[PDB]
Structure formats: C-alpha cells, structure tokens
C-alpha cells in the first residue's frame, strides 16, 4: 500500500507537469477560432467579388 | 477463622480477574488500503 501510494503521487506530479501543455492547447484553441473567423471573411470577400463579376 | 479465609478467597478472585483482563491477543489489522483512496489530484485550469 505504501508503494502504491508512492506511484499515485508520481502520477499526480506528472499531471501537474502536463498542465502547461493544456494551457498551450487553450492558446491554440483561441488562435484556431480567430483564424477560422478571419479566413472565412477572406473567403467571403472572394465570393463577393466573384458575385460582383 | 472465616474472616481470613474470606479475605484470601476475595484477594484470589481479584488476582484471577486481573489476569483474565490482560489475557488477550492484540492484532494489527489496519493496512494501507485507506492510503490508496487518498489520491490527491490537481484541478485543471479549464
């Protein structure tokens, strides 16, 4: 039981280490949304010019 | 001498009673099973 409790604490420390990559995933999630919104407008502008043509 | 015989018998009864009181088997049956249920885990900043 003491050996198992050590390994459980080892996993808890590793999950604390992976908190940083979660933050990067949140940062990329924000950047993905801003890209999908801005590029659709760029697609919409191109479609509007094609509509004018 | 009934008084002296009574006192010895009662003193014997007290001595047998004390010997019975410590006549037992201690056990240690508290393992670390509850330690395995104390997995402290960090709340993630969602």
| Interface residue A13 vs chain B (CB under 8 A) | no
- The owner of tokens 């502008």 is A45
Q: Interior CA angle at B42 toward B41 and B45, to 5°?
A: 150
Structural tokens at position B20: 């019975």
- The owner of tokens 């509850």 is B34
Would you say B36 and A8 are in contact if contact means Cβ atoms under 8 Å apart? yes
Q: Interior CA angle at B34 toward B31 and B40, to 5°?
A: 140
Residues of B in contact with A4 (CB under 8 A): 32, 35-36
- Crossing angle between the packed helical segments A2-17 and A19-52, to the nearest 10 degrees: 30
- The owner of tokens 């479609």 is A47
* Cross-chain Cβ contact A8/B36 below 8 Å: yes
- The owner of tokens 């043509």 is A53
User: Any residues with CB less than 8 A from the CB of A22 and at least 6 apart, and which?
Assistant: B44, B45
| C-alpha closest to that of A5 among B28, B32, B31 | B32
């Amino acid at each position: 039981g003491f050996e198992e409790a050590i390994t459980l604490e080892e996993r808890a420390q590793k999950s604390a280490e992976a908190q940083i990559m979660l933050f990067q995933a949140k940062r990329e999630n924000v950047q993905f949304q801003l890209e999908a919104a801005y590029r659709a407008r760029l697609h919409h502008v191109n479609n509007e010019i094609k509509k004018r043509l | 001498p009934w008084i002296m015989v009574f006192l010895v018998s009662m003193a014997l009864l007290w001595a047998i009673m004390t010997m019975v009181f410590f006549l037992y088997q201690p056990r240690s049956v508290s393992s670390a099973k509850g330690f395995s249920d104390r997995t402290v885990y960090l709340n993630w900043k969602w």
